[PDB]
Every structure is written in structure tokens, then in C-alpha cells.
Amino acid sequence: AEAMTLFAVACAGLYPILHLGRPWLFYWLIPYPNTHGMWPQFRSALAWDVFAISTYATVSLVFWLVGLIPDFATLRDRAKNIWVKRLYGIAALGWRGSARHWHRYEMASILLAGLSTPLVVSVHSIISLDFAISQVPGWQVTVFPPYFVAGAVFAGFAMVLLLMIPVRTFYGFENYITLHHLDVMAKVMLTTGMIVVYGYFMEVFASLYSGNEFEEYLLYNRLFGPSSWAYWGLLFCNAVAIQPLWFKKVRQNIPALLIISLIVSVGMWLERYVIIVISLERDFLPSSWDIYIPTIWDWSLYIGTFGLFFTLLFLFIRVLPMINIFEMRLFLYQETEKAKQR
Amino acid sequence: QLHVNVVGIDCRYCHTSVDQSYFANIPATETCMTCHSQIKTYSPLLEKVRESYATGKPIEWVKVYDLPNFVYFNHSIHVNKGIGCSTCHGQVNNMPVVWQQQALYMGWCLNCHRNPELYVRPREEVYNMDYVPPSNQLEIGRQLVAEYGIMPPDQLTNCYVCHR
Amino acid sequence: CHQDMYDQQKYTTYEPSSFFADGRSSRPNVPGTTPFEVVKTDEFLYTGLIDGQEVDAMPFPVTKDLLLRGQLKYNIYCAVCHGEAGYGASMVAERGGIVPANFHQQRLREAPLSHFFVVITNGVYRGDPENGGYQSMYGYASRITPEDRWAIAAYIRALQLSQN
Amino acid sequence: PFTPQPAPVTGNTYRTYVNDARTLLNSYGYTMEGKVHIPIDRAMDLIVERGLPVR
Amino acid sequence: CTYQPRQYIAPFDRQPEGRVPGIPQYFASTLTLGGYGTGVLVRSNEGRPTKVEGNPRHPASLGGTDLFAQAEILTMYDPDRSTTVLRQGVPSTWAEFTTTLGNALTAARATQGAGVRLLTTTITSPSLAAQIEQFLQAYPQARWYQYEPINRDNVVAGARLAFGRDVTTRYDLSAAQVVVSLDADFLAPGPGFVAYARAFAERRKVRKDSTTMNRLYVVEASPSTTGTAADHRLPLRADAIAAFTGALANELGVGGAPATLSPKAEEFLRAIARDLEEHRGQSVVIAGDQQPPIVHALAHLINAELGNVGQTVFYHEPVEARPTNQTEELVALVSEMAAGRVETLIMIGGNPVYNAPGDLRFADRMASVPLTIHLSQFVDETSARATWHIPQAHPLESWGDARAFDGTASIVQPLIEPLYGGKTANELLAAMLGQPEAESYDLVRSFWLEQIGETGWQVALANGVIAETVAPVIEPTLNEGAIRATPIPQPGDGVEIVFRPDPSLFDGFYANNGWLQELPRPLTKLVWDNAALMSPRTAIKLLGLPFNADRLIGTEADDRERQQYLEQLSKVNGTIARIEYRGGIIEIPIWLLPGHAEDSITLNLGYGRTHAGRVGNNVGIDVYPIRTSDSPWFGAGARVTNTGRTYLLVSTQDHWTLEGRDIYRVGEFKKFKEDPKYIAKEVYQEEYGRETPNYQSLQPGDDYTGRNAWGMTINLNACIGCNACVVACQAENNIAVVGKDQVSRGREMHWIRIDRYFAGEDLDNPSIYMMPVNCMQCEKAPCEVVCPVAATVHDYEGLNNMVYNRCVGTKYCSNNCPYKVRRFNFLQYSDTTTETFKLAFNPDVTVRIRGVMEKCTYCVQRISGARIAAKRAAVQAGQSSYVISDGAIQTACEQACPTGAIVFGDINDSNSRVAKWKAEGHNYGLLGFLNTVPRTTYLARVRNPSEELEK
Ligand code: HEC
Ligand code: HEC
Ligand code: HEC
């Protein structure tokens, strides 16, 4: 989970640089000392985005490194090649698994979880807020930060499904990742899918309840407009296909769970399309109405970012272990201790 | 150094446009030829100057003070509002070959556009670089700022002041 | 470092051009052309000759501000190689040997004001058709506007009256 | 590239003639045949007062 | 590595005399559309023309100019302007040309001159008309034979029928109450367009003190720029305007003819005949040149009936030197070369191979002439056919003269020595006079000195106008019988093509102009292409389209479904339709035009050129080789059949109707007279149920009390869709031209756009509404709060400061500005290579690199220059005040609007025109519910309809 968070962060974080068209001046959004004496505006939501993605990237990297230090200590201790033992050695920093070191380990890991838990909610609230502070009718919606947070957990749980069913099957980790693991993960995805469907209802209620023409034409152009195909595929994907996950046999069925997670990811992408592109298509002045058609280069960059993600994931599953070796030994201890005290 | 401190020509003789336009006039060949058709022509240091004014090709001078061309400096409003040369160019009157005195930053330009009292002078913008800023530069600067109508820094640090 | 619009595609005041033949983007004045609301309908304002001779008069009456404008325009252009007093003896007259004429001789005191205006405009002398010759002061029509040339003539008269 | 030391010039300069003529402009005085140096800003006031001819 | 390259800098060898370097100079010249020249002020930046403004002293430029005058800069700096004398396409010199011309001259002086022939456009140049008169004196059998495709034959043939003498008609529209336009385009560019538009809109601009507002009737086939501004616009077939005019003569009481019409048309005609004969002397009947000569004859007869002659209609001496019937002179010339009589053919401009009607087959009889001559200004379609093509000097680099619509005869001035060679028509006519190497300076001096004198020539050069000369007033008797003894031709055979000048390309001479092809066409917004124009009923009946054009009919009770059906009526645009005219097949795509007359087709002349430059090398589809010389403007036989093969027809708007929002506020003059604020009160009662909105805002803003706050004012009653303001703000601010591909994507680069909105009942005879949209310069701007590098900020003066060098290109600032006026340099749009295009850039504005934003800055180079001028003149006097005049800043799209709808100035100062305009009750800001507080506000279009068609 930490690894694909870092790799999705590396895939995402190129896009604020890449979408500029003067991308070599990306550091101008960063407050840096210059001879000009200028500053970032700091009330823009892209100015919040730069701090947000940088802090999120750094904290997720920090959590990965402290989560990796004792597994580095094990991999140094079993490497059997002399030069690789130094390489995992300075990676482990000579971790020396011990009390008065494990105390600070659990203490700092629980506390960093306490730092990163509000943080990822806020960083995806700020990814929401780059639409939610804007005056576009489909973008100025007050539900957007918890709704984008729920959509993010929903799409991410889809991706963790789609990339851990092969890790469970092909690499023989069936005992470590049981079927109850996938059951509870489908349950949490079901929770976030209901909150996302509730967010769609909130959008429909905002457009119907309001007497404004612009919210009503938003709902019309989403429902019956030229780009209305994405909204119909959104209610087919992210709403109809999630009601299967209420039943346990659907959750325990591995091919059904994989394919429903794939529909979650595609319809989540469709939700971002409906939020951004469709609301930018038709605006306040009808002279400023135009269709958006992607080129081959948008899809080329999307497939290429899939390549960067999968490449970094494959180096991760090669040089480093993909399951926490410690905290599974601790989980083994906790399981046999529950089996002791009953 | 030889023309202004020694021979003694005022800078509006050659830069004739310094108080009318944004562009202080770069001197033509004819400006040299009022003197140098008689003051040692057939000299090796002036074969380019005598190559011009016979054929029409300009003497290709090299720009010393250079702005990046969307900054839009105006010379006339600086000399007219009591800012003389040698606050922005240094003592050019002593320069045998001219160097840039400081880098033309937004720091330097916004420094005078935020505190114009430190460098403003009681007119005499085009006076030779024998001028020295007095001790009461805060006092005489505030009086000259209020006297010339130098606007508040909330107006002079606007972006469409310089960039356009 | 990025240099985006640092040297723009457009032509600045004296930006060099490869399209024009001489190498100048700034083009010379087209002959016979005048700008909007600027006319040559009065010959005495823009040349010194009404009937073809010297006049000893002015188009506009003299004011103290016009006189001080003539003083400033004298001290920029004219006072180099003529002296602030007007006696010719300046420092350009020492290195080179131009030998400029003093103002306060009787030949110039008897001379009219329109004689002065013609001297500012067209310099004086030209190579004689036989036995050769040279040009001496080369004319200051491009640098001084003709109203300011008449102001220079007025301060010439102030200088001759000051020293007589 | 430190600030250049511009070589202190020698010989006569324009300033000697300039302040000699600046003394010669004001402050009254005599010459070879002229009756008195009427000063500039006094001779200037006189030459506007008796006027130049117009047209 | 160093921060910049060295930047060599080139001074002069001899300085230019009267200019301080770094200060633009303004020169007066003359620019001719169809020979009729409008007085222009052309900015001389460093001795080169950069921006064309209006010369305020001239007739047909009362401050402003039309769009072709404004794009004469990019016409002048076209890289495909002809560079050398070409003998047979191989380069030659002027000396070789003049030796051969002397040989051809002595070949025809032995006879009296039966072989030598000319071909010009309409020459309103008394220098050139004098020179051709001496040439016809030296060669008595030689003839002139002038022609342009956008000619004035029917106004002069109506003069011949009505009075027996070539007269012109000058309409004083400032003293008019009921202007009636039987297929007339006086609010479209042409003869006296700017003066007629200024007079019409000065009677249109309504305040609370205004007690009179005029009423326009236009009866037209093609919707046009005059069609929008009318209170009543009747779409009637161009064949039927003759019958409509005869029926108007019948009802008004003069000798005309009875006619039959549709009941909308017949009720409209009785409404016209009731508004006329109520305003006797205070009415104008105008006919356009498209219409036959009997329409102009009957218009003269009507204008004599209602007392309009001498008070609002003024008959004048012919300003076009010798007037003729130019299409009759054409068929005379083509028959002459068909007989083989023509030996020497001289063409001054005109593009006669391309611009002729195609029934003459002009290029096939062109090769019958052994020695031809072309003065061309572009290596063109005719200069390929003809021998001895001569470079023609552009008017910005030529010495000459041109008469206006009232015969003012202003002097064309060269702001630069001629760029690519350069030989004017006066120099060409002096070469055919016999003497070589005569410059256009000495020729027009020798004509105009000793005619007005040297001291008058100096004033004629300083001011634009000539004081003494004007067209004298004449009052010829009107033959009420000879007009009556004319057929007054009756409409109706079938589908009828109307031939129209293109509103941005005119006759096609401006087809190589990059600005004009990029500029969206009025009422269609089509760029870079030509299209057949249909009514929705017309295309439904003709193309076999499975639609109704009757679900477009209805009231406001089903308005949104009608708008959605009109949106469904789109995406059939671009359907290629094969028509058949009299022998000609054009195969042109169709564009739906809801204002169009039924069974009427509008093909636009000007496209389909082959030998234009890199701009418009094959743009559009040619209308000329189907056009028939017998009836050059319309004809009643057309076979519109479907073809399939849908073409990409590219528009700037895409969406046609305002979708039930408060964008364009419309009123009536009686209720505006009784209550000026009633326009907002009827809007806000439906939206909020309160007469006055209460827009609470969290953000404070700035106060702007003691400052010079710049604001724009646009009068919707006065704007017509002229589109000269878009070309002006393009020329002033170096906005790059993108191709057809980037407007197909939707990335046109226009700082001001015109919104055309088609809103009205029945949706096939709708009310058309043009709205200029620049940036509102929003005091509480949504577009500054989002852009993260603080590149669009507000200043002390309250105007949005878009900094191109700080933009990183987030394009968030696009998404949040609710009017979508910002423009992004998606690719490198600016011309980085072509040196002639580098000369056209105004150096007071940054030329934008790829990846930065763009929007109109309240034309801030002019604001900054006037600010520096005010502060310099304040410190020169010593006042320490810095007071800036109200007329100190005229923005370019204000300075070039012919109707004066755009008004700019300081709004804190109550004495200014813009603050007095903003104090009016029908002033409103666009999208008030977003708390932007615009500085560009709009006056609501207050109409003056009649009691017979609305009440
Ligand atoms: C500032 C524009 C002026 C004015 C008003 C005058 N001068 Fe000159 N001057 C110079 C030289 C070498 C002479 C002697 C001979 C000559 O030029 O042929 C003069 C003399 C005059 C005259 C007498 C008339 C005459 O014969 O020319 C007058 C009326 C006059 N000066 C006025 C040289 C110079 C300069 C050296 C480069 C400078 C600068 C000027 N003059 C400037 C002016
Ligand atoms: C008189 C008012 C001058 C004008 C304007 C320019 N020059 Fe000159 N220059 C002048 C003098 C009296 C002197 C010193 C005496 C001497 O001649 O050495 C100089 C010095 C120079 C020199 C050396 C020799 C010379 O011929 O003058 C050079 C090469 C020189 N100054 C360069 C120069 C240029 C390029 C000028 C045009 C902008 C120029 N000077 C103008 C007199 C005057
Ligand atoms: C102090 C020595 C300054 C330097 C460095 C710069 N400017 Fe300035 N400039 C200064 C003052 C006090 C004023 C006028 C004050 C006023 O009343 O406005 C100016 C004037 C300008 C202006 C005029 C704009 C305006 O007044 O609204 C501009 C645009 C301008 N100067 C440009 C400019 C640039 C680009 C500079 C950096 C090279 C620059 N100035 C420096 C004082 C000083």
C-alpha cells in the first residue's frame, strides 16, 4: 500500500509540472529566494497543491523508509552476497532490533500515522479544492472535499485489489493475505462507494433544489448533453456495479471481485471526467461553449504513466519485500497470543 | 572619460532623447562628425566612424545595460521626476569603457519604486557626475517626493507599471 | 537562463534588421512627409528666409521661459566649442584646432537673428566647386527642433547683449 | 569581475574654461571695449524687455 | 553561459529630422476599399507603419475606421507581396519594362490607338483620373474600362434612369427618424460606412435625456450587419425587393406598381408605409447596389415624395470621376478581346482573371492579347496569366490621392519608402504617358500644387482633408414617367443565390490577409473558409435533411425545446451541397443561418483563390466562376442537391442561442422613456422576485476612491457586428493568427470577441444580437484568486494585470474567469521567423511566447503612455498632481469602432463620458450574480419598434 502510494505519487506529481507548457518554471510555484522579490500567491489552490503534493510525497516516503528499516535489517542478515549485505546494511542503518529501539519504533510509527491520517484527507481535499474554490457551477460544490476523499479511497482500493490479487496468487502469499483480507477490503471499498454514490445524489439534489439556471443546465448537459455518455457510464460503473459487493459470496468470488474492481477504476476515472471536463464544456456564456475531444497524446501520456507506475512497482517487488516481515511476525505473535488467552 | 570629464559635452548632446522618450537616443554618426571631420580625421581609431557617414551602415554598438524587452523602461519620467544618471549608471563621466554598474533586477528597480526618497535629487538630472547625495537624504528625499508628485509604492510596484 | 521573451521577435527602437539594406530597422524620414497637425505653412518658422534674405526678426515674441529654454539648449549643444560666455575659447577648441568664431565680434552683432537660425540649421560652408574646401559646424537640424533653434538665437542675442 | 578602477585623468579639463565663463556670465566686469558685462538673468531680463523683433 | 546574448544596437547615419527616437509619430493618409478612400491616421513607429487609426478630420472616418483599413497593416507586411518586375514570371527590371513599353507605345502611335486598352478599378484619384485623361487624349481610340466585382453600377444606373445624369446620393442619417433599407448595407463596410454608422448610432445611443430615437427597417435576403441593428427586419428574397419597393411606391402614392407578398411581408410593407408619410423629411429610403437600377430609381422617387431630398438625402456631383456601368464595360472588353481587336491591355489592380464573372471566360480571352500589363501588388492569378507584371506599391508606402464618398480628395502619404520595389499607378500612367522615371511624389505634387497651391498642399498634408474641394450639391429633376416606364422585375422562379461581398475579405483582395481570414465572419462566426448560407427551412426543403424547421416555431412557453432543436439543427453544417447555376457548379458546404430569407442562398465572393500567398492559398470555395455577368448579384435558378461528403466548417461560437440567461438585455424605447431602469427590473423580478438585487459579497476588494479607475462602456444599441474592433485590438496588441486547425480545436486568439445570439420567437425569423466581449476587468476577479504564481493581479488603477513573463501556464485562470475571455498560447502562435511579420509587431506590447495567457489589458500600452505623459507634463509644470485627461486614452478597439459603442475612460471622475454612461439606468454588468464587479459594463439594447409589427 505504501509502495503504490509512492508510485502513484510519482505518477501524479509529474502532471502539475507537465500540464504547464512552461514546465521549467515549476519552481516559481515554490516560495524560493529570488532576485525578483516575488512570491507564490498562496491563496490559489494550485499554490496549496504544490505544498500539498510535496508534503504528501515526503511523508509517504518517510513512512515507507521507517516501515522498511527493520525489513532492511532482516534482508541484510540473509543476503549471502557480501556486497549486498552492506547495501541493505546502510539501508537498515544497522537497525539492531531491540527494546528502547522498538519503543521509539512503535511510538514514532503510531505518531506518524497520526500525522499522515489527517494529512492525506487534507491533500485530497486540496485536490478537490482546486475545483471547489473555483466559480464554475459543477466545481463550486461544498460536498467536494469529503466526496473527493471518498472517491480517492474508492479508486485506490480498486487499484490495491487489481494489483494484489496477482500478488496473492502468483507469489505464494495465500497464508499472509487470506480470503478474509479481500472480504474486508471489499467491505471498505463498499463503504466508500456508498459515500461516493451519496455525493452523486448530493450533486443531483444541488442541481434540482436550486432555482439557478446554471446548476439545472449542468444536470441537463450531464444527463442529455454531448458528453453525457460519461455520466451514464458513471452511474452504470460507480453506482450499479457496487451493489454486488453487499453480498458475501460476491466478495469472496475472486474473478468477480477483480472485474468489479476494474469497473471501479474505470468509472472513477469517468467521475473525474464528469467533474472536470463536462463542467468546463458548458459555462455561463453560451458563446463560450465548446466540446472537448482528447487527442492521441492524452492517451499516450496516460498509458505512459501506467508504464512508469508498473516499472517502479516491478523494481519494488524485485529488490525489496512486498509484505512487512516484521509486523507479520508481530501479527503472528498477536494471533498466537489471542489463541493463548482465548 | 575623455569626452565628458575632459572634453566636456553634456549627455543630452549625444543622448538627445533622454527627457522626451523612453529611449535615450543612441548617438548617430553625424553626432561624431560635427567634431571628427576636423578634430583628427584620418586617424586609425575612427575608421569605423568614417566608414559610416559615407556608406549608410550603422556603427554596430554593443548594448551595455540590457533589459529583457518586456520590461519597458521609460527614461523621460525618470529624469523628469528628479532621478539623475549615476544613480542608475554610475559615474559614466569617468568611464573609459562603460561597464554595467549593477544588475538590472526587480530588486533594484522595486527598491527605488518602494523607497524613492533615498535616490531622488532636486532636479539637475542631467548634471555631470560631480553630484553627491547629502546627509539629509531622508528629509530632502521626502520633500522632493512630495514636491514632484512621486506616487505611493502601491502604484509604482504594480505589474503593468513596467511589464506590458 | 530560460530566455523566453528576453529578446523578442519584434523590432525595438534601434534593433538591427537583416531585412532592410543598411542594417537599421528604424527607417529614415520619407521626403516630403509631415506628421498629423504639423505643418510647414509658415516659412519663417522653419527656415530663416522669407524673401530669400536675412530678416532680423522672430516668428514668436520672446518670453523669459523661451529665453531659458534657449539657454539650456545653448548649454547642451552650442556651448561646447563656443564657450558658456560665447567667446569660442572652450576645450574642444584647444585639442584639435577647430578655431570656432566668437559671438561678440562686430560681424555677428550686425548680423541678423535669421542668420543665426540658418547657421543652426545648415552649418556653415561647403567644399568650394574649385580648389576644394571643408565643412565646419555641420548643422544641428536633426537634434534641435526649429522653435528651440530660434530660442538658441534669442539666447545668442542675450549673450551678445550680455558682453557688450 | 570587481568594480573597475577608472584611471584618474590628467591634463587640462573642460571645467577650467567652464567655470571661467560661468564667472564671466554673472558678476559684472569689464573687457577690451565693452562698457560693462551685463550679467545673464539681468541681460536676459533686459533683452526680453526691449524685446526681439517679431516677424 | 551568459544571461542574454550581446544585443548589438544600430544608430543612424543621418538622423531623421523631426522625430525623437522612441516616440511614435502619426501621419495622415487615405485607404480605399472600392476606390472610395477613408482618411486614416497611421502610426509611424520608427518610420514604418504599425497601426491604422481613424483620421478624425475626414469624412467616412469620424474617429473610427472599418476593418479593411485596420488590416491594411498586415496587407502591407504580407511576405508574399510582389518583389520584382516579372516579364513572363522570370524577374526583370523597370528599365527593361520601360523600353518594351516604349516599343509598344510607338507600335500604336502610328494609328490613333485602336489597340491599346486599360482596365482599372473605380478610380477616385483626381491625379490618376487626370493622367488617364491625358492618355486618352494622346490615344483617342483607347478606352478606360474600369471594373471591380464589388462595384456601384446600380446606384449610378438608377441615377441615369431617375435624373438623366450621373449623381451620387449622400444620406445624412443624423437627421433621420425612419430609415428604410431595401436590401441596403450602409451598416456594412463600403462607401461611407463609418460616417453612416456614426450618424445612425449617434441617433441610436439613448439616455434619460434623449427624447428621440430613430427606427430602422431593413428588407433583405442575406442577414447582414444592417440586418441586426434594425427594430424590424423582414427576410424577403432578393428577387422580391424590386416588388417590395414597387409596393412601397404604390402605398406611398407615387407612380409604382402593385405587388403580391406573404402576409408578414405585406403587413410589414403597410407598417413601413405608415412610418413613412408620418416622417416627411425625417425619413430615408436606402437601396443597396445588389438591387436592380429600378430599385434605386424608385428609391429616388420615394425620397422626392417624402421631402427627403435636400434635408436628409443630398444629391451630389459624381465623385467617381467618369462613372459607367462597369459590368457593361466588362462585357464590352471581353467581346473586344474575343474579336481579337485588343492589342495592349493594361491592368491596375483588380484581379480581373479571378474577379470576373465566369460566364465571360476571361482568362481564355486574356491569352488572345499579345502584350498585357499588370500592376498587381501581389503575384496574383492574373499576373500569372499576363505578361510584364509590375509590383504595385502599397498605399502605406505610396504617394497619391483618393476621393471619399463626399469627394474630399485626401492625399495618400507614404510612411515608408516602398519596400519591395514599389511602382504606383501614377508612375505607371506617367510611364505610359511617355516620360520614364517620374516618381509618385513629383506627379501628385505637380497635380495638386497649382490646383490648391503649395501653401494649401502643406495643410492638405498636415490635416488629412483638403479644405477647398468637395462634391458640390446638385438638384436634378426627377423623371416620374421614365421610372414608371420600366418593368420593375417580378420575383420567383425557384431557389435563388444571392452573391455577397465577404464581410472580412471584401472582393478577395484581402484573402492573403492573415488577420481577416482568422477574424470571424459577422452573423456566422465562420473563419478560414467559405460556406453557402441557408435558412433552416431552406436546407430542410432542399438538402433532404430529416428535420422539421417547425419545432423552431413557438413562444417562450416552449423556448428551451426550440433552442435545443436549433442545436440539433447544427451538425448538419458542413454538408457539401451540389448546386447548379446557369452552367456553373460550385459544390460548396452549407452553413445554417436562422435569419436568412427562405429559398435564398448566400454565396460569399472572395474565396477560392489559387495564387494568394501562404495565407489563403486555397482557402474557401470559389463563387466567381459560376457568377453571371447579366445579373451579377442574384439569380433565380438553382438546383441544390445533396452530395454527402461533410466538410469541416469551423466556427468560433458553435452555440447559437443564449440558453435562457441574462446576457443580452433588450428593452423598448417607450417604457425606457417612461422608466429607464425597467430593463433590469423585469429581469430581476423573474429571477429573484425583487426589483433590485442584493448581491452580498464576502470579499472586500479595494475602494478606488481618489484614483483614476479605467472602465469600458459598450452600447448594445450602437454595436452592429462591424468586427473592426476585433481587428483593431488584434493589430494594436500583436495577437497572433492561428490557422484553421487551431480554431477547429477551439484555440483562436482574440482578446475581444463578438457574441451573436439569434434569440427570438419562431427561431427562423429571429432577433440577432451582437455583443462585444473583452475582459470585464473584474474588481473582485475570479481569475486572479486562482493563478498560483500571482501573475494576474490588480493594480492601483483597478485593471487586471496579466504578466506574460510570470505565467507558467496553469490555465486555471482560464477555467475560473466566468466570461472565458482569457486566451492561451497553446503552441508557438507568434510568427517567430517571417521578418515582414516581425516588422508589423507594435513594440510597445510584448509578443507572447508559447505557454502564457492572453486577454485584453484595457490596452494598457496606451494607459501607461498617457500616464507617463501626464506625470511628465505635471512635473514639468511642477503641479505635483498628475491629472490625466478624459480623451487622453482612447483604446484601439474604441478608436476604431465606427458606431462609437465602445466608450473608455476614468469612472471615478464624474465628468468623463464613461462615468456618465455608467450612471444611466440601463447600464448593467455581465453576470452580476458572480460578485466580480465588472469595469466593462454594457448598456442594454433599447429598441424602438413600431405600433404595427409589435403592438
Ligand atoms: C549651437 C547649435 C551653435 C550655434 C548657435 C553656433 N555654433 Fe558654431 N562655430 C563652429 C566653428 C568651427 C565656427 C567658425 C566657422 C564656421 O562654422 O564656418 C563657428 C562659428 C559660428 C557662427 C558664425 C557663422 C559661421 O561662419 O558659421 C555662428 C553664428 C555659430 N558658430 C553659432 C563650431 C561649432 C561647434 C563645434 C562642433 C559647435 C557645437 C557649434 N559651433 C555650435 C554652435
Ligand atoms: C566634439 C564635441 C566631439 C564629438 C561629439 C565626438 N568626439 Fe571624439 N573626441 C573629440 C575631441 C576634441 C577629442 C580629444 C582630442 C583628440 O582628438 O584626441 C576626442 C577624442 C576622441 C577620440 C580620439 C581622437 C579623435 O579623433 O577625436 C576618439 C576615437 C573619439 N573621441 C571617439 C568618438 C566617437 C566614436 C564619437 C561619436 C559618438 C565622438 N568621439 C564624438 C571630439 C569629439
Ligand atoms: C529609482 C532610482 C528608480 C529606478 C531604479 C526605477 N524607477 Fe521608474 N521611476 C521612479 C519614480 C520615482 C517614477 C515616477 C513616480 C510616479 O509618480 O509614478 C518612475 C517612473 C517610472 C515609470 C512610470 C510609471 C508610473 O509612474 O506610473 C515606470 C513604468 C518606470 N519608471 C519604469 C521603470 C523600470 C522598468 C525600472 C527598472 C529599470 C525603473 N523604473 C526603475 C524611480 C525609479
Ligand code: HEC
Ligand atoms: C519594474 C519596476 C518592474 C516591476 C513592477 C515588475 N517587474 Fe518583474 N522584472 C523587472 C525587472 C527589472 C526584472 C529583472 C529581469 C531579471 O530577470 O533580472 C524583472 C524580473 C521579473 C521576472 C523574471 C523574468 C523571467 O525570468 O522571465 C518575472 C517573472 C517578474 N519580474 C514578475 C513580475 C511580476 C509578477 C510583477 C508584478 C507584481 C513584476 N515583475 C513587476 C521589472 C519589473
Ligand code: HEC
Ligand atoms: C535610472 C533607472 C536610469 C537613469 C537615471 C538613466 N538611465 Fe539610461 N539606462 C537605464 C536602463 C535600464 C538602460 C537600458 C534600457 C533597457 O531597457 O535596458 C539605460 C540605458 C541607457 C541608454 C541605452 C538605451 C536605452 O535606454 O534604451 C542610454 C543611451 C542612456 N541610458 C543614457 C542615459 C543618460 C544620458 C542618462 C542621464 C540623464 C541616463 N541614461 C540615465 C537606466 C537609467
Ligand code: HEC
Ligand atoms: C559623443 C558624446 C557623448 C556624450 C556626451 C555622452 N555619451 Fe553616452 N554614449 C555615446 C555613444 C557613442 C554611445 C554608444 C556607445 C556605447 O555603448 O558606449 C553612448 C552610450 C552610452 C551608454 C551605453 C548604454 C548602452 O547600453 O549601450 C552609457 C551608459 C552612456 N552613454 C551614458 C552617458 C551619460 C550618462 C552621459 C551624460 C554625462 C553620456 N553618455 C554622454 C556618446 C556620448
Ligand code: SF4
Ligand atoms: S465592437 Fe466596435 S467595431 Fe465591432 S461592431 Fe461593435 S461598435 Fe462596431
Ligand code: SF4
Ligand atoms: S473574465 Fe475578465 S474580468 Fe473576469 S477575471 Fe478574467 S479578465 Fe478579469
Ligand code: F3S
Ligand atoms: S492561472 Fe496563472 S499560471 Fe498562468 S495560465 Fe493563468 S496566469
Ligand SMILES: [Mg+2]
Ligand atoms: Mg536582450
